[PDB]
Amino acid sequence: LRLEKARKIILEILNEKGRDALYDLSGLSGGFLIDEKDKALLNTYIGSSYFAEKVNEYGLKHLGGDENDKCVGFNRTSSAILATILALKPKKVIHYLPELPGHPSIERSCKIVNAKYFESDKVGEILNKIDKDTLVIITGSTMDLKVIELENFKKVINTAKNKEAIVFVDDASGARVRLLFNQPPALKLGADLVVTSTDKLMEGPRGGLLAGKKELVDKIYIEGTKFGLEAQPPLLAGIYRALKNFNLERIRKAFERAKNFDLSKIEKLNKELKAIDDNINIVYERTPTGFVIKRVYKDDTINIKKLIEIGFNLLKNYGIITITVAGMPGASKSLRIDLTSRDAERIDDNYIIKAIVESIKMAFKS
Amino acid sequence: LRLEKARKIILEILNEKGRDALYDLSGLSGGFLIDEKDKALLNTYIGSSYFAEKVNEYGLKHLGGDENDKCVGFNRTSSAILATILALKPKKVIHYLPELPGHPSIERSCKIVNAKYFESDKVGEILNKIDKDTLVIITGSTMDLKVIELENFKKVINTAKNKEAIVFVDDASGARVRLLFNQPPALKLGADLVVTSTDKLMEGPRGGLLAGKKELVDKIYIEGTKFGLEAQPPLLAGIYRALKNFNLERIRKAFERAKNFDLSKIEKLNKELKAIDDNINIVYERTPTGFVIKRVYKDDTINIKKLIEIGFNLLKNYGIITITVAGMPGASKSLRIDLTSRDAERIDDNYIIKAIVESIKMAFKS
């Protein structure tokens, strides 16, 4: 599955030093944070009921559910969406979202149940299509930090209420993102159902949480279990630890860290290395979650080569894992540092910037 | 989710002594056996590709695949079955199995794709229904240790070959069970596809492995990923460790242990306790995988109560986990010891029999 040199060195580091010497700053990492107590519980039959109970508990808390609500774990968010559509068998699904290519899981699930599908990021195109035979789905946010406007959110919910239509909020990232923007949880807004992802601004694995009216959640969960769409206990355990450790303030501090991150040594290095070679041109950009180094060299072919070499230098010498350590483009290619990553808590700004400076310098030896 | 007293005491034992003091002999336990190296890998992005590769490797080995084959992980076996049926879109599915209520996942998957479904444990009823528009599924075995006759297996495969029909073997338990009976792996028999469960006579979690022709496995896997039916990396890691540690001889030795297990102290205790109370009547039966104590008292209401009390005694004093520790009937009720359980390797016959004898005695204090 393309280039295993990155795997090898991580294993060298793990053997010679240990897990604490590795830092995945790529942002795209699942968070499996179970302890030996969990591990022991996972090797008993009472482990399945135990973690399902903790997920219900910390999941309801996270999603603003009340005593009439239940929260269950699915293998992925797409799994919860398919289970919902298979259980409810809507004749039509109306999908309101921030930007107008959506994720295809809802549409694909519709195809399977021969339900009609319609999507739009325009509230006016949503409102007049809502009737009793429609399942209304609202994607709350993007990872890009675009959100559905709160008044629009409330208008859609109000219309479904009037038409006796079920409202199912896709808060895959929105259960975190919208809250950063001071919006209430989906269930507090009157949503019948909500789904969120346990690895989007959370320290859990990829997985889904589905919450809402007990009756609805139960039916959907039973449907899901027919085909193994539900989260198994090892996944429920990782989800529980994510939920238990989750705190919104942590996310706000990570975003602030990125905002205040001193990147001037990069510019200093850029002008410094032109002594070696006039074709060196370090281009970087600050990002909502950290920063990206897009370029280090003017000639496009050497640029690619050098970025990969720097990524390898970062890993080898500093234990920092990034995407450029995997060969060639397709996914990213830019050297990306995501400060919202759990591992970024283990290292200060000084470690990161010095690691980057030295890793670049190393690749541009005369 | 009914009675959490069993959870509490296990947590007391874990805190006061540790994981090694717990023994789940119920047989129905998933096996999550990952080490800190795995755990560290699961908290990086290279963890997903790494464990997928190990599963392909140790899965192909386990299932008798060749260089043209691939092996992938699904969340459950039902997940692989749905993915297969969604990808291949057969017009009809023919399901040959050992005994004639089958598991409903295939039929349910058929309903979703509007495919016709037919099942039979009679080979003659299978052969004449096979044509080009049929997906032929063979369930290889039951956990009851019934298997499809080898010549019948070969006849079905031969007919599908003649009719250009795909053969998909449900070796959920059969990938182990049939081998105990000296049958070749499904892929060696000419099956196009095979699915097996990673917790049936294996020390993995519940999950599925799907293996066969690369082209077929790829298509099905891509279909599965649309709805999160594929095994996530934490599940792939547990599967890998199961596969890595698997050895057929271990299973044969566990079965031999059950065959040779001295249960005479139970009978000795039975006759001994009639001094206390003439209504005491310990009824036990040897089992292919261990033994079951069905009864301890003649009056049916006290019987129930005492069996639960004994189960609690077993847990409290000896760390042995069984089903009777969960209150009332519905599931099991009989005190069951499964010697194929991983935890049974940590204790000798003497520990188990003395634990049972003393736990019964304790419940029948005057």
Write the DSSP assignment of B246-289 as a string of letters.
Answer: --HHHHHHHHHHHHH---HHHHHHHHHHTTT-TTEEEEEEEETT
Beta bridge partners of B285: B292
Alpha-carbon distances of B115 from B110, B123, B133, B145, B160, rounded to whole Å: 5, 21, 10, 30, 18
Does residue B188 sit in helix, strand or coil? Answer: coil
CA dist., res. A51 & res. A62, Å (int) = 16
| CB-CB neighbours of B295 under 10 Å | 18
Does residue A152 sit in helix, strand or coil? Answer: helix
Is the Cβ of A7 closer than 8 Å to some Cβ of chain B? yes
| CB-CB neighbours of A13 under 10 Å | 18
Beta bridge partners of A72: A210
Could you tell me the domains of chain A?
A: 1-28+246-366 (3.90.1150.70), 29-245 (3.40.640.10)
HSE, CB side, 13 Å, CA atoms: give it for residue A221.
21
Residues 198-217 of A with CB under 8 A from B: 205-208
Asked whether the beta carbons of residue B208 and residue A227 sit closer than 8 angstroms, the reply is: no
CB of B72 closer than 8 Å to CB of B230? yes
Hunting for tokens 């850029």 — which residue is that? A270
The values of phi and psi at residue B152, to 5°, are -60, -45
Q: What is the 3-state secondary structure (H, E, C) of A288-320?
A: CCEEEEEEEECCHHHHHHHHHHHHHHHHHHHCE
Asked whether the beta carbons of residue B234 and residue A30 sit closer than 8 angstroms, the reply is: yes
Hunting for tokens 């007391």 — which residue is that? B12
Nearest C-alpha in A relative to B25: A44
CB of A38 closer than 8 Å to CB of A241? yes
State the structure-solving technique: X-ray
CA dist., res. B319 & res. B311, Å (int) = 10
Asked whether the beta carbons of residue B52 and residue A1 sit closer than 8 angstroms, the reply is: yes
Q: Which stretches does DSSP call E strand in chain B?
A: 23-24, 69-74, 92-96, 116-120, 134-139, 167-170, 193-197, 208-213, 280-287, 290-297, 320-321, 335-338
| First-residue to last-residue Cα distance in chain B | 34
Alpha-carbon distances of B90 from A109, A172, B116, B131, B161, rounded to whole Å: 19, 33, 9, 11, 16
CB of A153 closer than 8 Å to CB of A64? no
The alpha carbons of chain B give a radius of gyration, in whole angstroms, of 23
Nearest to A187, CA basis, from A287, A67, A327 = A67
CA dist., res. B152 & res. B149, Å (int) = 5
Beta bridge partners of B293: B284, B335
Nearest to A172, CA basis, from A238, A117, A102 = A102
Asked whether the beta carbons of residue A229 and residue B227 sit closer than 8 angstroms, the reply is: yes
CA angle A274, A276, A280 (to 5 degrees): 45
How distant is the Cα of B247 from the closest Cα of chain A, in angstroms?
19
CB of A32 closer than 8 Å to CB of A353? no
Nearest C-alpha in B relative to A229: B229
Tokens of B99: 């005994």
Nearest to A227, CA basis, from B221, B79, B199 = B79
Burial class (CB in 10 A: 0-12, 13-18, 19+), B47: buried
Residues 312-351 of B with CB under 8 A from A: 321, 323, 342-343
CA dist., res. A197 & res. A37, Å (int) = 24
Alpha-carbon distances of B263 from A224, B72, B292, B323, rounded to whole Å: 43, 43, 11, 20
CA angle A27, A33, A37 (to 5 degrees): 180
CA dist., res. B77 & res. B210, Å (int) = 8
Tokens of A189: 């807004």
Element (H, E) at B35: none
The values of phi and psi at residue A19, to 5°, are -55, -35
Resolution in A: 2.0
Where b means 16+ CB within 10 Å and e means fewer, B324-351 reads bbbeeeeebbbbbbbbbbbbbeeeeeee
Residues 83-122 of B with CB under 8 A from A: 86, 104-105, 108-109, 112
CB of B72 closer than 8 Å to CB of B87? no
Nearest to A23, CA basis, from A365, A344, A360 = A344
**Residue B45: which residues within 8 A CB-CB, separation 6 or more?**
A24, A26, A28, A29, A321, A323
CA dist., res. A112 & res. A39, Å (int) = 37
Longest dimension (CA), chain B: 72
Nearest to B344, CA basis, from B263, B289, B294 = B289
